[PDB]
Design a protein around this nucleic acid. Structure first.
Ligand SMILES: [Zn+2]
Ligand SMILES: [Zn+2]
Lengths: 197, 197
DNA sequence: CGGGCATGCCC
DNA sequence: CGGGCATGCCC
């Protein structure tokens, strides 16, 4: 069986979608999201808020898993891991894991025994009784350019909503560039899309 | 006592000097030496020949030690080591050592018990009975830019001629930039010296 | 090969 | 903060 997890969007019967905060115009804004490119540009180790939107209320015990995969065919079959430098200069998160969660008391970090892929899971909590979404705070512990890790290869983060029995209820994904200057780099990429895409 | 080794030139009673091969004009020549800057520009893990010149013949049992130090005050007191990536993706040389020697059957790699500095030592052999110098082949296992290692800080390589009793007979040093394009980068630096130095 | 993009950092 | 150098890599 394949060790490449699926990345296909499956908004599913709960109408699961992700949302992202608007950000300021700064060259080096800490986290910014491009809707045109479905891509988050963010700094390493800094907070990246991701909203979970649903139309119907998931069952008790639903879980939210995040996993990184390389976006291009060239590396899709390789596990995305933290580079040796940021592993050394590393809480609960194992030091080889790229994605950490902040702000949650029931995070689990998983290393798949068969595929060796890392993921990090938190309980699904429904929005607070006005809010329309639930926010989870992720961090990415390397820049996309880290040699010996991502090494300039783009990743997708895949966010799956799973029930406690393991059924896939919903799946969404977004591309990530972890970088020193998220505002510069988002604008560059959007302009490249318009000119050459 | 100070854990910063001396870097002062001491050509000493044997008239010890270093020499370096001339190289071609290629942007990405593997090894090239600037006399104006007393600086070797070279690629990582590739052969860097360094000649030892003496006016008088060192005693039997003389040893040739090479050691890297950071050239600037900012890092001079820090030990120069291979970055975590090139340590992982690593023979006789310990994987934390930046400088390796090729082509010699009696290399010793040393980790100083007091200063924690690395060095690599080979027996001094007098030139073959026409030659005027003895060549040792070094390699540097990271680029000067490796994050988690040199991290763009310039190094000096200090080459000492020592007798078997430990007396310092001679000392010379040269700056090193380990880089993808030694020819480009040597020309850049020489031009910066002329314009702004 | 040499031109020119890349992208964390300038200090 | 935004301009612009850095430097391994383009694929
Ligand atoms: Zn890293
Ligand atoms: Zn290195």
């Amino acid at each position: 069986s394949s060790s490449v997890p699926s990345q296909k969007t499956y908004q599913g019967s709960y109408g699961f979608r992700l949302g992202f905060l608007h950000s300021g115009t700064a060259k080096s804004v800490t986290c910014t999201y491009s809707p045109a490119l479905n891509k988050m540009f963010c700094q390493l180790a800094k907070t990246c808020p991701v909203q979970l939107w649903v139309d119907s209320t998931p069952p008790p015990g639903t879980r939210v898993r995040a996993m990184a995969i390389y976006k291009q065919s060239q590396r899709m079959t390789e596990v995305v891991r933290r580079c040796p430098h940021h592993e050394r200069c590393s809480g609960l998160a194992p030091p080889q894991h790229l994605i950490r969660v902040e702000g949650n008391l029931r995070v689990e970090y998983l290393d798949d025994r068969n595929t060796f892929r890392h993921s990090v899971v938190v309980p699904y909590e429904p929005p607070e009784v006005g809010s329309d979404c639930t926010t989870i705070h992720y961090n990415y512990m390397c820049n996309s350019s880290c040699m010996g890790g991502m090494n300039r290869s783009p990743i997708l983060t895949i966010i799956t909503l799973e029930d406690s029995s393991g059924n896939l209820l919903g799946r969404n994904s977004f591309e990530v560039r972890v970088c020193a200057c998220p505002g510069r780099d988002r604008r560059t990429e959007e302009e490249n899309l318009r000119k050459k895409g």
